[PDB]
Design a protein around this ligand. Structure first.
Ligand SMILES: CCCCCCCC/C=C/CCCCCCCC(=O)O[C@H](COC(=O)CCCCCCCCCCCCCCC)COP(=O)(O)OCCN
Ligand SMILES: CCCCCCCC/C=C/CCCCCCCC(=O)O[C@H](COC(=O)CCCCCCCCCCCCCCC)COP(=O)(O)OCCN
Ligand SMILES: CCCCCCCC/C=C\CCCCCCCC(=O)O[C@H](COC(=O)CCCCCCCCCCCCCCC)COP(=O)(O)OCCN
Ligand SMILES: CCCCCCCC/C=C\CCCCCCCC(=O)O[C@H](COC(=O)CCCCCCCCCCCCCCC)COP(=O)(O)OCCN
Ligand SMILES: CCCCCCCC/C=C\CCCCCCCC(=O)O[C@H](COC(=O)CCCCCCCCCCCCCCC)COP(=O)(O)OCCN
Ligand SMILES: CC(C)CCC[C@@H](C)[C@H]1CC[C@H]2[C@@H]3CC=C4C[C@@H](OC(=O)CCC(=O)O)CC[C@]4(C)[C@H]3CC[C@]12C
Ligand SMILES: CC(C)CCC[C@@H](C)[C@H]1CC[C@H]2[C@@H]3CC=C4C[C@@H](OC(=O)CCC(=O)O)CC[C@]4(C)[C@H]3CC[C@]12C
Ligand SMILES: CC(C)CCC[C@@H](C)[C@H]1CC[C@H]2[C@@H]3CC=C4C[C@@H](OC(=O)CCC(=O)O)CC[C@]4(C)[C@H]3CC[C@]12C
Ligand SMILES: CC(C)CCC[C@@H](C)[C@H]1CC[C@H]2[C@@H]3CC=C4C[C@@H](OC(=O)CCC(=O)O)CC[C@]4(C)[C@H]3CC[C@]12C
Ligand SMILES: CC(C)CCC[C@@H](C)[C@H]1CC[C@H]2[C@@H]3CC=C4C[C@@H](OC(=O)CCC(=O)O)CC[C@]4(C)[C@H]3CC[C@]12C
Ligand SMILES: CC(C)CCC[C@@H](C)[C@H]1CC[C@H]2[C@@H]3CC=C4C[C@@H](OC(=O)CCC(=O)O)CC[C@]4(C)[C@H]3CC[C@]12C
Ligand SMILES: CC(C)CCC[C@@H](C)[C@H]1CC[C@H]2[C@@H]3CC=C4C[C@@H](OC(=O)CCC(=O)O)CC[C@]4(C)[C@H]3CC[C@]12C
Ligand SMILES: CC(C)CCC[C@@H](C)[C@H]1CC[C@H]2[C@@H]3CC=C4C[C@@H](OC(=O)CCC(=O)O)CC[C@]4(C)[C@H]3CC[C@]12C
Ligand SMILES: COc1ccccc1OC[C@H](O)CN1CCN(CC(=O)Nc2c(C)cccc2C)CC1
Ligand SMILES: CC(=O)N[C@@H]1[C@@H](O)[C@H](O)[C@@H](CO)O[C@H]1O
Ligand SMILES: CC(=O)N[C@@H]1[C@@H](O)[C@H](O)[C@@H](CO)O[C@H]1O
Ligand SMILES: *[C@@H]1O[C@H](CO)[C@@H](O)[C@H](O)[C@H]1NC(C)=O
Ligand SMILES: *[C@@H]1O[C@H](CO)[C@@H](O)[C@H](O)[C@H]1NC(C)=O
Ligand SMILES: OC[C@H]1O[C@@H](O)[C@@H](O)[C@@H](O)[C@@H]1O
Ligand SMILES: OC[C@H]1O[C@@H](O)[C@@H](O)[C@@H](O)[C@@H]1O
Length: 1091
């Protein structure tokens, strides 16, 4: 027919596809509006017609029925079919159903081949991630059972008032001179709880020695509701699964850490690291490795298919001077300094214009515009000239990128950014489509709920900071979820709207968006990347007993440092013991240094770096001793543990690897500093002096209304009473150094809440912040996070991994983070890993795979039975569960004994047999003990039965074997990390003790004692809540802290030191990043690939 020919001709024509794409984009723009005006209703038909028209065409050319090369045969045409039928259903007859219209956005993926291919590759990646997903579910369930057993109902502890019975009249309580109907109704009343200081949270409390303490007049009691609206708790197994999924993603995990330790006890912190350093880091890095290998296979398949005048120095110096001159800007500039800045900028732009004109005269426009850099310079100079005749100046900053001409690593960053929207732009487009789809889905589903039930989730009188009422805020929430903060807003979402639907939407966006982001990250990363005396001295130094003695002295001296608590002044004998011990260590180490000098001579001793370190430490000790016979030099004694680096080979080899990587690390650090200089200068221009708040101290610590107080001038003018304080946010953009600090907090994603809240309220220059005017400053931070964090971390990781690959290649292909003995044990483990394979009625029955499958089903059923445990369960439920446990123990005993009925070969045939034997023996031990927190441990011992699942699983077994193979390298890395934690905790004890308790620093997670400092350092090893700890350090003087305070040891107030605090926290954050992220990822990926 001719109709078929016409339909085919219109179908194949590119104009038709372009029309479909344009209408899809227009519909996407219309779906952004939260409140569609009535007239747009008419426009709806247009789309419904167009979507019909095109569909009709596809129906005419192809065949509706099923057959080769037909309409419904193509999977994506199902999208057209569903969209058209849904549109007709919604419009023809009678709504939340309209949210399904968002699926029309996916038509974009249909109208471009590149997006189809990208989605296909993503689907194969998801398919390959199946084993890791199963392992993650299994580990999360196991740790969730462990946490449920350990902390069942712990989070419901609260410091309630100490009630008194009214002479047992009717079981009533007369607390605080008020009678309540019953004890149960009294306890559930939140008017008698105790709020945590400076927070709107009920103080969790415990009765264990380590757990938190109830202030005088209060007592710990379990009655109440779980914290943060009751969505965090270990009471039910499913709640524990949610909490440990939160832990695994390290999402606001410091809050759960602090709550659990406050309620149960500090010792339980152990549990947390066993879930973080082996449950969170390990699982995420395993996912990283699996995705990377899948992408590598995809790239290999694609590759196989494809197969078959000296003035430049002057200009660069001028650019460097100009960028530095722009960096000479800050808050409260003097008039003369501002004039000097203006004159300098004017002369710089003048000279740049003159150079551009001269070198465009030398080569005419045809020649001049022949270079990309030349057109870039022309655009920059034109923009600067237009601005000369406000962020309009920031364009000039981009000139610094010219330094990429001969800077290879800045060129690598430029290549990364180019590939982001170049070769790999299709995947970026897919990510953008996903983000838009999820933003509109969330807004359409939750806009009315957020609007009409705002008071539920709005602590302030106005609307909440994060919501889905408007499209921009929905996109902001989706972006925040992508950045990793997916639960803090989820609690509000579930509180204001449906729990089930919000759970589903947020979990889906988390999983899918993080998958896409990780695919983009890995794709970019792979795409872009006397004589007798001397003899005696040598003999005495050479004895191994001498080395052991020196090691013992090093460790014991470090321990002696570990006692410098605030409580020494109370402990007298220990103080004098420590003084004598310190003198002894100084003397013995000096004696050892002299012996080494004599035995080996000055040249050999001073030609060894570690000898230099030991000599420096001893020199500091001697300087301190002679000064005593400098107070700022005493605290440098906290570097004593560094003597342990040279002795133990594990830390020595790890330090060798890190030193080898130092040059590349420094190159990338310089590139990152130059790149972040642009964003810090822009932030200084946008937000210099606009971060101040005229707070009223008496009425809390919240910014005043902009109507009553408008700016600093009015804040000082209304000073009849000394209540108003014009204070600036701790971390801000008043300078470029403060710019780097705030940018670091935004990039690491800790403490960015306050920075963005202060930015998106910046009303003017030192003017009082309005609630949320100047809103679109949000974009600023978003942009930064796209470049300053995503691409910057990509460069970090790529360069460091490339450096480690070069180091491995140089070292004969062997490992980098292992010793000789560890290498031999690793070889033995590898050999053991791939070992080759080696009454009649029962022998024939048990050996059958059906028996193993039945045992597997039985153990799965037992796991399900343990999932049912819950706090405050009725006694009959307890009895039934105990009986079921006894039955399961009996069944396992029966199966093990019938297996034993075979010859003794099974007694040693495999290691899993002995594991089964020992777990059964423990099971009977626990059951017999039941006839007699020890009970909690006995119950927790039952989790060993679940591990029997490992036998059947293949992917689980391989991944766990990879972890076991990686264990020694991780042991070395963790040893070095623990040494660094020890040193930094001693520094904190020396400095940060006595600081005012605010934000992260509370009565339990202080820096006062070694225990508390170690807890804080452990939590901020993952960079979690380091802004919280840093905040109390920064504040100096009123109204925050009170200097001139009678402190125990150092009576110079309770204020922190901003300079040393910032240095301490930034250096520790960077060191911990390096080690735990880069090295741990390197080990995980290497041992997974080899495994
Ligand atoms: C081949 C061998 C290579 C490995 C050895 C090289 C690495 C060793 C490290 C050198 C960096 C140490 C620099 C010392 C900084 C101390 C400055 C200082 O004394 O001030 C103090 C600074 O304290 C701080 O918080 C800064 C924290 C800096 C930590 C440096 C220690 C890092 C230890 C880990 C080494 C690196 C990782 C392991 C080795 C790769 C404050 O006291 P105050 O000012 O006197 O207070 C006044 C009233 N109390
Ligand atoms: C996860 C991270 C990925 C890797 C990071 C890549 C490198 C990006 C780095 C950024 C370094 C951070 C620099 C922070 C500078 C802090 C400046 C600041 O706080 O404000 C200034 C005052 O405070 C001070 O910092 C003065 C003391 C100087 C501290 C020096 C900090 C050294 C930087 C840490 C080391 C950098 C990393 C290198 C590691 C080997 C001025 O502002 P103000 O409003 O006038 O207040 C006056 C009160 N004194
Ligand atoms: C990736 C792709 C597609 C994910 C969407 C899966 C289809 C969702 C259909 C089930 C569903 O969402 O219904 C929800 C029912 O809640 C459930 O039972 C969750 C069922 C999830 C089963 C597995 C979901 C797989 C997701 C993929 C919410 O509806 P509602 O409870 O009536 O809401 C009342 C208003 N407060
Ligand atoms: C108001 C009530 C407050 C009373 C204070 C109660 C404190 C009781 C608790 C102490 C728990 C600390 C146990 C941590 C053990 C792990 C650290 C450790 O043992 O390392 C060693 C340090 O061991 C210690 O910290 C023992 C000293 C305990 C600190 C508390 C002092 C006792 C105070 C209460 C009596 C040193 O290793 P290294 O030489 O640095 O080697 C580095 C690389 N290998
Ligand atoms: C705690 C972190 C250790 C992670 C668990 C290590 C599990 C090792 C594993 O099951 O891998 C398999 C090894 O299986 C075995 O023969 C050992 C059987 C013992 C299973 C129970 C292990 C309990 C783990 C806690 C004790 C740590 C053991 C460390 C061993 C050096 C790989 O064998 P494959 O699949 O035939 O080779 C391919
Ligand atoms: C009886 C009252 C208290 C209401 C009942 C609420 C529970 C039935 C809900 C509350 C929150 C829900 C949890 C919220 C979060 C998760 C995380 C989610 O994690 C994953 O999806 C992991 C995916 C992966 O491993 O990649 C699995 C469902 C789960 C446990 C949900 C299971 C059901 C829970 C516990
Ligand atoms: C009356 C009050 C407000 C005076 C306080 C002003 C200072 C806080 C300003 C004046 C000089 C400024 C500095 C001028 C020059 C630089 C160079 C600039 O150099 C870099 O580019 C470092 C990073 C790199 O090497 O790329 C970093 C910011 C800094 C230290 C500036 C930080 C803020 C400073 C110290
Ligand atoms: C009190 C009422 C209002 C709420 C009761 C909670 C239920 C509605 C919870 C119980 C288990 C929850 C489900 C548990 C797990 C998921 C997995 C989640 O999907 C993933 O986690 C992605 C997995 C992957 O693709 O790898 C989507 C939400 C969903 C279906 C949850 C939806 C909500 C459910 C059904
Ligand atoms: C700073 C002050 C002294 C410096 C040290 C001075 C001498 C050396 C010797 C140097 O050893 C050599 O590789 C050859 C030079 C030599 O040892 O004579 C290694 C760096 C190191 C430890 C330096 C590291 C940095 C230090 C501690
Ligand atoms: C208050 C008035 C002075 C302020 C000045 C004093 C110290 C200055 C800082 C000195 C050192 C740095 C380190 C610099 O970062 C690095 O040098 C990284 C390490 C490296 O160089 O590799 C960025 C500027 C900054 C924060 C400077 C910003 C401005 C500061 C805070
Ligand atoms: C109203 C009062 C009595 C509250 C009682 C609630 C409990 C009886 C609930 C809370 C947690 C629930 C469990 C949460 C999660 C699962 C996982 C679920 O896992 C599966 O085996 C199905 C998915 C799969 O493995 O393919 C089986 C049901 C079970 C044990 C649920 C059974 C019912 C439990 C124990
Ligand atoms: C009507 C009156 C008596 C109200 C009280 C009823 C309770 C005694 C019920 C409510 C929930 C029930 C539980 C719900 C779910 C399970 C899972 C079920 O799972 C299995 O373990 C199956 C395998 C097996 O046990 O053989 C075992 C019974 C048990 C614990 C039930 C035991 C009896 C419970 C505690
Ligand atoms: C108010 C008082 C009574 C509180 C006492 C609480 C302590 C019992 C807690 C707080 C600090 C905790 C420790 C902090 C740091 C570590 C390091 C961690 O790393 C290692 O030490 C492994 C290598 C080694 O064996 O040294 C092991 C757990 C441990 C000892 C923690 C165990 C429990 C501790 C000692
Ligand atoms: C990298 O993320 C993750 C890694 C591991 C487990 C979970 C993760 O969260 C998922 C997603 O990556 C969200 N990220 C965004 C950026 N990230 C910054 C960062 O790496 N901080 C950091 C530092 C400075 C030192 C040590 C360890 C870490 C994680 C924070 C979290
Ligand atoms: C000038 C000014 O605003 N002073 C306030 C006062 O109005 C307020 O009543 C008090 C706390 O209630 O804090 C202060
Ligand atoms: C912050 C915290 O958890 N507890 C403290 C408590 O130790 C202190 O005695 C009291 C005095 O204001 O303030 C609160
Ligand atoms: C407060 O409660 C505690 C709980 O044991 C009790 O010992 C005490 O007598 C009560 N009264 C106070 C602290 O004044
Ligand atoms: C006070 O602040 C709120 C939000 O910060 C704002 O909506 C209101 O207009 C301000 N003025 C008042 C309450 O008089
Ligand atoms: O400066 C005068 C006083 O008030 C202000 C504080 O920063 C301190 O300097 C002192 O307590
Ligand atoms: O907070 C520090 C304190 O120092 C000074 C006091 O007069 C208070 O007004 C102030 O709050």
């Amino acid at each position: 027919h001719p109709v078929r020919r016409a339909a085919v001709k219109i179908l194949v024509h590119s104009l038709f596809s372009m029309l479909i794409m344009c209408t899809i984009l227009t519909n996407c723009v219309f779906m952004a509006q939260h409140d569609p005006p009535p007239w747009t209703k008419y426009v709806e038909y247009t789309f419904t017609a167009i979507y019909t028209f095109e569909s009709l065409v596809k129906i005419l050319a192809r065949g509706f029925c099923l057959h080769a090369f037909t309409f419904l045969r193509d999977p994506w045409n199902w999208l057209d079919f569903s969209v058209i039928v849904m549109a007709y259903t919604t419009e023809f007859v009678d709504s939340a159903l309209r949210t399904f219209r968002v699926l029309r956005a996916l038509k974009t993926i249909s109208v471009i081949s590149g997006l189809k291919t990208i989605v296909g590759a993503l689907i194969q990646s998801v398919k390959k991630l199946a084993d890791v997903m199963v392992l993650t579910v299994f580990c999360l369930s196991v740790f969730a059972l462990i946490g449920l057993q350990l902390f069942m109902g712990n989070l419901r502890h609260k410091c309630v008032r100490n009630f008194t019975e009214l002479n047992g009249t009717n079981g009533s309580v007369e607390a605080d001179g008020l009678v309540w109907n019953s004890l149960d109704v009294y306890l559930n009343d939140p008017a008698n709880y105790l709020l945590k200081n400076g927070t709107t949270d009920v103080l969790l409390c415990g009765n264990s020695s380590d757990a938190g303490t109830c202030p005088e007049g209060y007592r710990c009691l379990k009655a109440g509701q779980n914290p943060d609206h009751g969505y965090t708790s270990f009471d039910s197994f499913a709640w524990a699964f949610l909490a440990l999924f939160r832990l695994m993603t390290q999402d606001c995990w410091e809050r759960l850490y602090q709550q659990t330790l406050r309620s149960a006890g500090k010792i339980y912190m152990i549990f947390f690291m066993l879930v973080i350093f082996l449950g969170s880091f390990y699982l995420v890095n395993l996912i990283l490795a699996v995705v990377a290998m899948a992408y590598e296979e995809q790239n290999q398949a694609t590759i196989a298919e494809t197969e078959e005048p000296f003035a430049d120095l002057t200009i660069t110096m001028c650019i460097v001077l100009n960028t530095l001159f722009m960096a000479l800007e800050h808050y409260n500039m003097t008039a003369e300094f501002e004039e000097m800045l203006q004159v300098g900028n004017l002369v710089f732009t003048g000279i740049f214009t003159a150079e551009m004109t001269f070198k465009i005269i030398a080569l005419d426009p045809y020649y001049y515009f022949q270079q990309g850099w030349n057109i870039f310079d022309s655009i920059i100079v034109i923009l600067s000239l237009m601005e000369l005749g406000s962020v309009l100046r920031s364009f000039r900053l981009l000139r610094v990128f010219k330094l990429a001409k001969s800077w290879p690593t800045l060129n690598t960053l430029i290549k990364i950014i180019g590939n982001s929207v170049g070769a790999l732009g299709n995947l970026t487009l897919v990510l953008a489509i996903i983000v838009f789809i999820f933003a509109v889905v969330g807004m359409q589903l939750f806009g009315k709920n957020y609007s009409e039930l705002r008071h539920r989730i709005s602590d302030s009188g106005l609307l909440p900071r994060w919501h889905m009422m408007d499209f921009f805020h929905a996109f902001l929430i989706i972006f925040r979820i992508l950045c990793g903060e997916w639960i803090e807003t989820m609690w509000d979402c579930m509180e204001v709207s449906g729990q089930s639907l919000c759970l589903l939407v947020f979990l889906l966006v988390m999983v899918i968006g993080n998958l896409v982001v990780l695919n983009l990250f890995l794709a970019l990363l792979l795409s872009s990347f006397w004589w007798r005396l001397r003899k005696t001295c040598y003999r005495i130094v050479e004895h191994s007993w001498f080395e052991t003695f020196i090691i013992f002295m090093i460790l014991l001296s470090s321990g002696a440092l570990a006692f410098e608590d605030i409580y020494l002044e109370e402990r007298k004998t220990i103080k004098v013991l420590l003084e004598y011990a310190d003198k002894m260590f100084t003397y013995v180490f000096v004696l050892e240094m002299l012996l080494k000098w004599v035995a080996y001579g000055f040249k050999k001793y001073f030609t060894n770096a570690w000898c230099w370190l030991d000599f420096l430490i001893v020199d500091v000790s001697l300087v301190s001793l002679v000064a005593n016979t400098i107070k700022s030099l005493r605290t440098l004694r906290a570097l004593r543990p560094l003597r342990a680096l040279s002795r133990f080979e594990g830390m020595r080899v790890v330090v060798n690897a890190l030193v080898g990587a130092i040059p590349s690390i420094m190159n990338v650090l310089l590139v990152c500093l130059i790149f972040w200089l642009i964003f810090s200068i822009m932030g200084v221009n946008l937000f210099a002096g606009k971060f101040g708040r005229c707070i009223n101290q008496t009425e809390g610590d919240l910014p005043l209304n902009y109507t009553i107080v408008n700016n600093k001038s009015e804040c000082e003018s209304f000073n009849v009473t000394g209540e108003l304080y014009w204070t600036k946010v701790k971390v801000n953009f008043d300078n470029v150094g403060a710019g780097y600090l705030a940018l670091l907090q935004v990039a690491t994603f800790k403490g960015w809440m306050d920075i963005m809240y202060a930015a998106v309220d910046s009303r003017g220059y030192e003017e009082q912040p309005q609630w949320e005017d100047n809103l679109y400053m949000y974009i600023y931070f978003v942009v930064f996070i796209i470049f300053g964090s995503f691409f910057t971390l990509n460069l970090f990781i790529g360069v460091i991994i490339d450096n480690f690959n070069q180091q491995k290649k140089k070292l004969g292909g062997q490992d980098i983070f292992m010793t000789e003995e560890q290498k031999k044990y690793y070889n033995m483990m590898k050999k053991l890993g791939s070992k080759k394979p080696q009454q009649g009625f029962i022998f024939d029955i048990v050996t059958k795979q059906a028996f193993d499958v039945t045992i597997m089903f039985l153990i799965c059923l037992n796991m399900v039975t343990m999932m049912v445990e819950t706090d405050d369960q009725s006694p009959e439920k307890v009895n039934i569960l105990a009986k079921i446990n006894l039955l399961f123990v009996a069944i396992f005993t029966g199966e093990c004994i019938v297996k034993m009925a075979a010859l003794r070969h099974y007694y040693f045939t495999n290691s899993w047999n002995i594991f089964d034997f020992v777990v059964v023996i423990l099971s009977i031990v626990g059951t017999v003990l039941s006839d007699i927190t020890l009970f909690r441990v006995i119950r927790l011992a039952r989790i060993g039965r679940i591990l029997r699942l490992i036998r059947g699983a293949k992917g689980i077994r391989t991944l766990l074997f990879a972890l076991m193979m990686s264990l020694p390298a991780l042991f070395n890395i963790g040893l070095l990390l623990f040494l660094v934690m020890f040193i930094y905790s001693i520094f904190g004890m020396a400095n940060f003790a006595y600081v005012k308790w605010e934000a992260g620093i509370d009565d339990m997670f202080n820096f006062q004692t070694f225990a508390n400092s170690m807890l804080c350092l452990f939590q901020i090893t993952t960079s979690a809540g380091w802004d919280g700890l840093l905040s109390p350090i920064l504040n100096t003087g009123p109204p925050y802290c009170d200097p001139n305070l009678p402190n125990s040891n150092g009576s110079r107030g309770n204020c922190g030191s901003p300079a040393v605090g910032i240095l301490f926290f930034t250096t520790y954050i960077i060191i911990s990043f390096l080690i735990v992220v880069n090295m741990y990822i390197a080990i995980i990926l290497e041992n997974f690939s080899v495994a």
